[PDB]
Design a protein around this ligand. Structure first.
Ligand SMILES: O=C1CC(I)=CC=N1
Ligand SMILES: O=C1CC(I)=CC=N1
Ligand SMILES: O=C1CC(I)=CC=N1
Ligand SMILES: O=C1CC(I)=CC=N1
Lengths: 262, 297
């Protein structure tokens, strides 16, 4: 019923797609950053996952924060010593945007081990706000997933949890996932996840919704499978640790498929 | 920064400090300035403003107040808004004795629904629709304003902040303390506002939540599973609620025609799922003849 906003689902989808284009980071930003690297970024996002888990924040908050970080680094040269300052400030902004009960600024200062002063966090907040020109309402992988999980006639906790997980793994790795739009990554996560559990594919209903076939979703699905396969060996583990818990039904502990079929 | 704005008068005071009417010295544009003090050593930019600014940035429609600029300093944020003559509440009270022409009521409700249809078609809930937050000009327009309690939602919706609408305009789903709420709550509020434009008194002026609840039942009939499935397994529902009957909208809103009464009931339906959508309501027979009259000021 009204919680799936039937009279509006279409219009919202159209709009989110149009918006995920404008809020897209620069694909090749990491090359034009002299002093920071995909590796350092990986550490940062992994740290936000922890922070998200420690403060029991929403997954959506985490996604937004990463969106804020990539777009800032798409405009602003940052030194390595201040990369965390940007991330703390972004998480702060996303919390304020998205959470009912955001952590107080003091707790965002606590998690940086007093690397930074409160004044620095608060000043970086304003600067982030100016650099994004307050365009904070970014469509996320989750905003697409939640809608895709709807066309999933057989509602599967395991499938829903698993897609979230693949979803989050993509946050960590600027290469390759900066070159895919959220809507795409959500589908690839959603396809990959359904198959692994039920045995099924991207449904036609979602083909008609998105205009996305498995042909057009293959490049991404390839990188994702790879990411899933290498997952236990990735230098960044917070997400796997996260999705062991009962809450997410231990989907991380599940063994990925070995072939996809195309 | 603000050197080109000349303050005229104070025009309001809400979430963030005071709102002032001001005049662009160079262009002659009249504006409303909202001054938001930034907690530079404590909490920073308030979540309210992050939400209002970001959401109003996206929302560009003739029936949503235009945010024209945001002027930053180290220590303050000024939001530059278009100036509109006054809010519906002030217009209502000014019209307490003369009444509001039916054609203007219809025009106003039509525009309100157009504005609101836009907000919902853009993953945004207003959640503070009340006459004081709706602005009119002199040429016959009305606009949604004050988007501070607004929230960009996902699909499906999740649990959002429970302390949302002003009591009088609060939907039963929020009162009863349901886990999920959606676009229907904003329709409920407009429905309250339709009634109020017609009678110039608030429809459900409750002193408390329990009183608000009783006020609605008495008018629309204590709901049951046949009208509102799940109403009895709602968190704050009580089997004990007296069973009042629905009052004829011919005594509720005597001045309202057969089409009006129909659309109202639809807007005030108990069940959120069966409650009309802003989009639906835009098609309703009531608006078939809608014009754009000017208000007497
Ligand atoms: O305190 C910290 C910061 C970061 I970035 C990663 C891990 N611990
Ligand atoms: O500095 C200011 C503040 C205001 I309110 C209006 C004009 N100039
Ligand atoms: O300078 C501005 C104006 C506006 I409208 C939004 C954000 N920044
Ligand atoms: O934009 C606005 C705000 C206010 I308070 C009054 C009139 N116009």
């Amino acid at each position: 019923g009204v919680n799936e906003v039937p009279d509006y689902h279409e219009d919202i989808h159209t709009y989110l797609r149009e918006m995920e284009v404008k809020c897209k980071p620069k694909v090749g930003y990491m090359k034009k950053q002299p002093d920071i690297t995909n590796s350092m970024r990986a550490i940062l996002v992994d740290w936000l996952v922890e922070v998200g888990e420690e403060y029991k924040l929403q997954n959506e908050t985490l996604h937004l924060a990463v969106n804020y970080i990539d777009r800032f680094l798409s405009s602003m040269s940052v030194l390595r010593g201040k990369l965390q300052l940007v991330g703390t400030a972004a998480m702060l902004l996303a919390s304020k945007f998205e959470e009912i009960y955001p952590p107080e600024v003091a707790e965002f200062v606590y998690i940086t081990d007093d690397t930074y002063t409160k004044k620095q966090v608060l000043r970086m907040e304003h600067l982030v706000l100016k650099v994004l020109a307050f365009d904070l309402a970014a469509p996320t992988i989750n905003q697409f997933l939640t809608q895709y999980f709807l066309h999933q006639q057989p509602a599967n906790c395991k499938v829903e949890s698993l897609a979230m997980f693949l979803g989050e793994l993509s946050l960590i790795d600027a290469d390759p996932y900066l070159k895919y739009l959220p809507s795409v990554i959500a589908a690839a996560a959603f396809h990959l996840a359904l198959y692994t559990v039920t045995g099924q594919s991207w449904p036609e209903s979602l083909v008609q919704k998105t205009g996305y076939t498995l042909e057009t979703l293959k490049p991404c699905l390839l990188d994702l499978h790879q990411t899933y396969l290498r997952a236990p060996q990735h230098a960044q583990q917070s997400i796997r640790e996260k999705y062991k818990n009962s809450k997410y039904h231990g989907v991380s502990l599940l063994n990925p498929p070995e072939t996809l079929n195309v | 920064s603000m050197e080109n704005f000349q303050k005229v008068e104070k025009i309001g005071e809400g979430t963030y400090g005071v709102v002032y009417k001001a005049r662009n010295k160079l262009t002659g544009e009249v504006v409303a300035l909202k001054k938001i003090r930034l907690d530079t050593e404590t909490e920073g930019v308030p979540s309210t403003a992050i939400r209002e600014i970001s959401l109003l940035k996206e929302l560009n429609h003739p029936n949503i107040v235009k945010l024209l600029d945001v002027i930053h300093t180290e220590n303050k944020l000024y939001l530059v808004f278009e100036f509109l003559h006054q809010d519906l509440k002030k217009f209502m009270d000014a019209s307490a004795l003369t009444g509001i022409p039916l054609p203007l009521i219809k025009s106003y409700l039509f525009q309100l629904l157009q504005g609101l249809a836009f907000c919902h078609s853009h993953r945004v809930l207003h959640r503070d629709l009340k006459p004081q937050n709706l602005l009119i000009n002199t040429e016959g327009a009305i606009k949604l304003a004050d988007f501070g309690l607004a929230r960009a939602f996902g699909v499906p919706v999740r649990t959002y902040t429970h302390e949302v609408v002003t009591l009088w305009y609060r939907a039963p789903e929020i009162l009863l303390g349901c886990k999920y709420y959606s676009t229907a709550v904003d329709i409920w509020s407009l429905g309250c506002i339709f009634a109020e434009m017609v009678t110039r008194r608030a429809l459900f002026p409750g002193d408390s939540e329990i009183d608000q609840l009783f006020r609605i039942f008495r008018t629309l009939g204590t709901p049951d599973e046949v009208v509102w499935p799940g109403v009895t397994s709602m968190p704050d529902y009580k089997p004990s609620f007296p069973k009042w009957a629905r009052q004829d909208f011919s005594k509720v809103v005597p001045p309202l025609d057969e089409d009006g009464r129909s659309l109202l009931s639809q807007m005030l339906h108990y069940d959120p799922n069966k409650r009309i959508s802003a989009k639906a309501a835009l098609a309703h027979p009531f608006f078939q003849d809608v014009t754009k009259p000017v208000p007497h000021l």
